[PDB]
Design a protein around this ligand. Structure first.
Ligand SMILES: CCCCCCCC/C=C\CCCCCCCC(=O)OC[C@H](COP(=O)(O)OCCN)OC(=O)CCCCCCC/C=C\CCCCCCCC
Length: 336
C-alpha cells in the first residue's frame, strides 16, 4: 500500500532533520517548517502533541503524524481544483503516486504541474513520464521522482519493491557494522544474512567493546561481557521496521542520550559504508536512526559493578509507552 511506499521514500528519524527540499522536517517526512531557524521549527510539533519537547518525538507519534499527514494530503487533493479531476479517474497505484507527490511538495505547489496533470487525466503515461523527467521535482528527488514516475507509467508496485530490496541490503550492512561496533567478535556478512533469511541470530560467549560504551554512555567502563545476544528482525515487514535486541548474562564493570551513538558511527563508518554502498552500486545516518528507533530492548540476568558496589538485575525491558520509551526494571539487589 501507500504507507509502505512513503516509508520507503521518507524513512524514519527521531531528531529534527532537513528534508529533500532543505526545510525542517520530523518523523516520517512530516514537514515542521519552511523557516530555516531551528527554534522556529519547535512550534508545529509542540502544537501537535501539546507539551514542550525540545524537538523530539516518539515512534507512535511519528506513525500517528504519518497517518495524519496522509489524511491532510487527501483533504488537500479534494480541496484542490486542478488535481481532483486528475485523481478521481485513477486506480489505487497511480492514486498512490499522486498522493505521494502531494504529500512530498504540498497541496499548493503540486497544482502547478498543469501539463502533466492534464497528461494524466487523458492517461498519456509515456510522454508524461518524459515530461516529468524534465521538472524541478526530478531535480529535488531524482530517485524518488523516478519511482513515482514509474508508478504513474506502469500502474503497479514494481518500482518500490526494488527500493525495498535495497533497504534490506543497506540495513544488513548497518547491522553488521553496529553489532561489530558493540562487540569484540568478528561478525561476518553471513551471520547477518542468517538474521535476514531466518528471523533470528544468536551469538554466544561475547564481549562488549568498552570503547563503544565509554563513547555512547559517556564514567568509565572497564570491561563488558555478554553471555548471549539475540537479534530478531521483522523480515516479513522490513519497511515497517521492528527490531528485537536481547542481552542475557550482561556483565558490566564500571569505574567512577541515544543520538550520540548515531554520531559515533556517523564518524567511524560513514566512509567505509560509503565505500561499500558505492561498491554495491551521509546515507548510513538514516538507516541507523530508523534501526535504533525501531528497536525494543530486553535484558536478563545482568550484573553491574561500579567504582566497588555490585548491582544484580533479574530482568529489564525498554519499550514504547504512553514522554519517551519506558525502562522497566525487575529484581534489583545491590550488595558488596
Ligand atoms: C549495557 C548494554 C549492553 C548492550 C549494548 C547493546 C545496546 C546498544 C544497541 C542498541 C541500543 C538501542 C537503545 C535505544 C535508545 C535508548 C536511549 C536511552 O538511553 O534512553 C533515552 C530516552 C529518551 O527517549 P527515547 O525516545 O527512548 O530516546 C531515543 C532518542 N534519544 O530516555 C530514557 O528513557 C532514559 C531512561 C533512564 C535511563 C537511565 C537509567 C539508569 C540506569 C539503570 C537504572 C538505575 C539502577 C540503579 C540501581 C541501584 C544501583 C546502586
Amino acid at each position: 500500500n501507500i504507507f509502505e511506499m512513503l516509508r520507503i521514500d521518507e524513512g524514519l528519524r527521531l531528531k529534527i532533520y532537513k528534508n529533500t527540499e532543505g526545510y525542517y522536517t520530523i518523523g516520517i517526512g512530516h514537514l515542521l517548517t519552511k523557516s530555516p531557524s531551528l527554534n522556529a521549527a519547535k512550534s508545529e510539533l509542540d502544537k501537535a502533541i501539546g507539551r514542550n519537547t525540545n524537538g523530539v518525538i516518539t515512534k507512535d507519534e511519528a506513525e500517528k503524524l504519518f497517518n495524519q499527514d496522509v489524511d491532510a494530503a487527501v483533504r488537500g487533493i479534494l480541496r484542490n481544483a486542478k488535481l481532483k479531476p486528475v485523481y478521481d479517474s485513477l486506480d489505487a497505484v497511480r492514486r498512490a503516486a499522486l498522493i505521494n507527490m502531494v504529500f512530498q511538495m504540498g497541496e499548493t505547489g503540486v497544482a502547478g504541474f498543469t501539463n502533466s496533470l492534464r497528461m494524466l487525466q487523458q492517461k498519456r503515461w509515456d510522454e508524461a513520464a518524459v515530461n516529468l523527467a524534465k521538472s524541478r521535482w526530478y531535480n529535488q528527488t531524482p530517485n524518488r521522482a523516478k519511482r513515482v514516475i514509474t508508478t504513474f507509467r506502469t500502474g503497479t508496485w514494481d518500482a518500490y519493491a526494488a527500493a525495498r530490496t535495497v533497504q534490506r541490503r543497506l540495513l544488513a550492512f548497518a547491522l553488521r557494522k553496529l553489532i561489530g561496533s558493540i562487540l569484540l567478535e568478528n561478525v561476518q556478512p553471513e551471520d547477518i544474512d542468517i538474521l535476514f533469511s531466518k528471523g533470528v541470530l544468536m551469538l554466544s560467549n561475547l564481549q562488549l567493546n568498552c570503547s563503544f560504551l565509554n563513547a555512547v554512555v559517556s564514567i568509565n567502563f572497564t570491561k563488558g561481557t555478554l553471555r548471549r545476544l539475540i537479534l530478531r528482525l521483522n523480515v516479513t515487514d522490513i519497511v515497517n521496521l521492528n527490531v528485537e535486541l536481547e542481552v542475557n548474562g550482561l556483565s558490566l564493570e564500571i569505574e567512577l542520550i541515544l543520538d550520540n551513538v548515531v554520531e559515533y558511527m556517523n564518524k567511524t563508518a560513514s566512509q567505509d559504508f560509503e565505500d561499500e554502498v558505492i561498491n554495491e552500486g551521509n546515507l548510513l545516518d538514516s538507516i541507523l536512526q530508523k534501526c535504533l528507533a525501531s528497536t525494543s530492548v530486553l535484558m536478563q540476568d545482568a550484573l553491574v559493578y561500579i567504582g566497588r558496589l555490585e548491582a544484580k538485575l533479574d530482568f529489564m525491558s525498554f519499550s514504547s509507552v504512553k514522554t519517551s520509551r519506558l525502562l522497566n526494571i525487575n529484581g534489583i539487589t545491590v550488595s558488596m
